[PDB]
């Protein structure tokens, strides 16, 4: 690999340099190389990886949607062709991550939930663009990954925990926008927000700001769905 000659620590530095320059492709590449040094990632390190690849796929998803709606309205092959080009590119980045999870990353409870949530998210991103035989294989996967992460979080983390909270938010969105199950989607989100405020005394100084936000986002989604 191209990062194979660099020190893990110099790769972490440059990932952080890239985030400052908002060069998230570089950022993701640096973090892929650090992961491939074979060592566990720290909490700070997990989130350098996630933020880098999320910003990458996020721009691709946004471009895909712009083109896809053009392609819908339009129904020349140039729109299909460009849509398919951005699509194939997006699929590759998800594979790169799902491969990085299924080979080095997938320990402690927060660590295991973190990576299983990533697995469910990037399977979900592929679901957004899939169709046919190959497609539904993808939906079940996003769901197993999420479920397993739900199981762990429910037993091992308090209901105010940011990872538990953010995972559930995304699992709700998965139900709504990916499984045509507004029922489950809304149930999870309401239960999640409710249970968290029921045990509101469990917020910690280190993450309370994050938990408050994910709770606000859970109610933002709920307002939007009803």
């Amino acid at each position: 690999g191209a990062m194979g000659s660099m020190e893990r620590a110099s790769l972490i530095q440059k990932a952080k340099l890239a985030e400052q320059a908002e060069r998230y492709e570089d950022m993701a590449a640096f973090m892929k190389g650090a992961v491939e040094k074979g060592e566990e990632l720290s909490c700070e390190e997990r989130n350098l990886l996630s933020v880098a690849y999320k910003n990458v796929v996020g721009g691709q998803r946004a471009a895909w949607r712009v083109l896809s709606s053009i392609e819908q309205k339009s129904n020349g092959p140039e729109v299909r062709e460009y849509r398919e080009k951005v699509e194939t590119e997006l699929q590759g980045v998800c594979d790169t991550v799902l491969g990085l999870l299924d080979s080095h990353l997938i320990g402690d409870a927060e660590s295991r939930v973190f990576y299983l949530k990533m697995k469910g998210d990037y399977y979900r991103y592929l679901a957004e663009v899939a169709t046919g035989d190959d497609k539904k294989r993808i939906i079940d996967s996003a769901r197993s990954a999420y479920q397993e992460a739900m199981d762990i979080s429910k037993k091992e983390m308090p209901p105010t925990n940011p990872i538990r909270l953010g995972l559930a938010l995304n699992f709700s969105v998965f139900h709504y926008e990916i499984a045509n199950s507004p029922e489950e989607a809304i149930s999870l989100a309401k239960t999640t927000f409710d249970e968290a405020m029921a045990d509101l005394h469990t917020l910690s100084e280190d993450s309370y700001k994050d938990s408050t936000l994910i709770m606000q986002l859970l109610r933002d989604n709920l307002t939007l769905w009803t």
């Binding site: 998210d121 953010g166 938010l169 995304n170 709504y176 994910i214 989604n221 939007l224 769905w225």
Partner: peptide, 5 residues
């Protein structure tokens, strides 16, 4: 669109 993190 719905919020994810």
């Amino acid at each position: 669109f719905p919020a994810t993190v």
